[PDB]
């Protein structure tokens, strides 16, 4: 049940890995993986009904 | 002898697993698995000799 992932290596001394094993049945006990996803800001930065083209007039 | 099972994941950060190993010979030493079964209440809620159909008259 071991889970192997790679570290994004900062200052160097192939890819380096680390190993994780979950000891508990409840997922709340698990540490945070930090393997997170990014999204694009559109829903906040451009919530407009008509798609905007930046080179064209915002208002036409 | 490791035993791998899956956690029913509550709040999220594929399936996640956890790992168990029994260290002792006596099964009394084992932790509780919590992998339990449910049964239907019939023997308590409907202990009647003649099977009951809920849409029909209980007494006929």
């Amino acid at each position: 049940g071991a889970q192997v992932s790679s570290q994004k290596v900062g200052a160097h001394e192939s890819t380096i890995n680390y190993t994780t094993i979950n000891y508990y049945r409840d997922s709340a006990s698990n540490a945070a993986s930090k393997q997170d996803f990014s999204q694009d800001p559109s829903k906040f930065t451009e919530p407009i009904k008509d798609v905007l083209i930046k080179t064209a007039p915002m208002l036409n | 002898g490791a035993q791998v099972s899956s956690q029913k994941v509550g709040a999220h950060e594929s399936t996640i697993n956890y790992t168990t190993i029994n260290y002792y010979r006596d099964s009394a030493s084992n932790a509780a698995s919590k992998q339990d079964f449910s049964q239907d209440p019939s023997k308590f809620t409907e202990p009647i000799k003649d099977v009951l159909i809920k849409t029909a008259p209980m007494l006929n």
Binding site: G1, A2, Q3, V4, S5, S6, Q35 | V4, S14
Partner: peptide, 8 residues
């Protein structure tokens, strides 16, 4: 083991 060790 093959399966289990999942890798990412």
């Amino acid at each position: 083991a093959a399966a289990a060790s999942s890798s990412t």
